[PDB]
């Protein structure tokens, strides 16, 4: 399939900065969600789940079509808990009804990362809603009860290499697992609504114990109260992933640069940008605007 980006009619940078600002102001306002984590992490997870359905082999799924709005994908068991992110974005979409669903879900993730003090993520507009019959089937998102070989093979379908995989997984600095959503419980670290390289530091520095949670699933726990999924821990079991974990644990700037590239790529997979499409936009944070 070919999905050509088409700019929302007449819109330019200033329009999308206004959407960014509305998301960012609501992140500030709705700060109590999930015991004062706020909505930043769930919006990043939503951006990953809506883009992470992509299949490079046939260009199905991905961010372009905005198909999470349809029942089949909305009710994917892998998407449990993401309804909170969708409901957050509802009043944004009502204020800016011209933005496509795919542009909104992906911009939500960009805004959340930046407003949580993460790297700038260049972002391109022009995803176009596609009909219900284009919704990918359930089962395209990854399982957490797996090893490094599973992780590596899984991410090949998204055209991600080892460095891109390890960089993307650093988003697990954010938020937490919730037993009723995923069968896992606990946060990955302490500063879980600020985007940092703490995921890699915790992997390397904590004393992890393989325990069973209350859903009878194995997860790695530390005495500080942190947790890692089996797939997270696989990044220090595999020697190639381990080298990259060590790199990002020792170089915050390199992690930010590599995450920004990999996250933009994730959100753009499947999309053909015409020769005369606008350049990627770099949005100012509220702090940078004095707002
Ligand atoms: C092997 C790959 C991955 C697996 C197996 C995985 C699995 C999970 C699981 C089980 C949860 C807990 C959901 C819940 O209980 O609420 C979670 C949360 C989360 N995921 Fe991942 N994930 C992966 C990769 C990614 C990537 C690539 C990103 C973004 C770049 C991401 C972003 C997040 C965020 C931010 C949260 C926290 C959400 C919240 O606090 O509500 N994940 N993931």
Author numbering: 4 to 294
Can you quote the paper on this entry?
CcP employs a heme cofactor to reduce hydrogen peroxide in mitochondria using electrons from its biological redox partner ferrous cytochrome c (cytc). CpdII reduction is coupled with proton transfer to the ferryl oxygen, with the distal pocket His52 as the likely proton donor.
To resolve these uncertainties, we replaced Trp51 of Saccharomyces cerevisiae CcP with 3-benzothienyl-l-alanine (S-Trp), a close structural analogue of tryptophan that cannot serve as a hydrogen bond donor, using an engineered pyrrolysyl-tRNA synthetase/pyrrolysyl-tRNA pair (PylRS_S-Trp/tRNAPyl), which selectively incorporates S-Trp in response to the amber UAG stop codon. Stoichiometric replacement of the distal Trp51 residue with S-Trp was confirmed by MS analysis of the intact protein. The geometry and environment of the heme cofactor and key active site residues are well preserved in the modified enzyme, with only minor conformational adjustments to the distal pocket His52, thus confirming Trp51S-Trp to be a highly conservative substitution. Time-dependent spectral changes were fitted to a sequential a → b model to derive rates for CpdI formation and are similar for both CcP and CcP S-Trp (k = 96 ± 3 and 100 ± 2 s–1, respectively). Oxidation of CcP S-Trp also diminishes the 757 cm–1 feature of the ferric state but instead leads to a new feature at 791 cm–1, which we assign as the Fe–O stretch. Density Functional Theory (DFT) models (vide infra) of the CcP ferryl state predict that the Trp51S-Trp substitution leads to a ∼0.02 Å shortening of the ferryl bond, with an associated 44 cm–1 increase in calculated Fe–O stretching frequency, which correlates well with the 38 cm–1 increase observed experimentally. The Trp51S-Trp substitution in CcP and CcP W191F causes dramatic 64-fold and 32-fold increases in the kcat of guaiacol oxidation, respectively, with only modest changes in KM. In contrast, the rate of cytc oxidation is only modestly affected by the Trp51S-Trp substitution (kcat = 819 ± 46 s–1 and 596 ± 33 s–1 for CcP and CcP S-Trp, respectively).
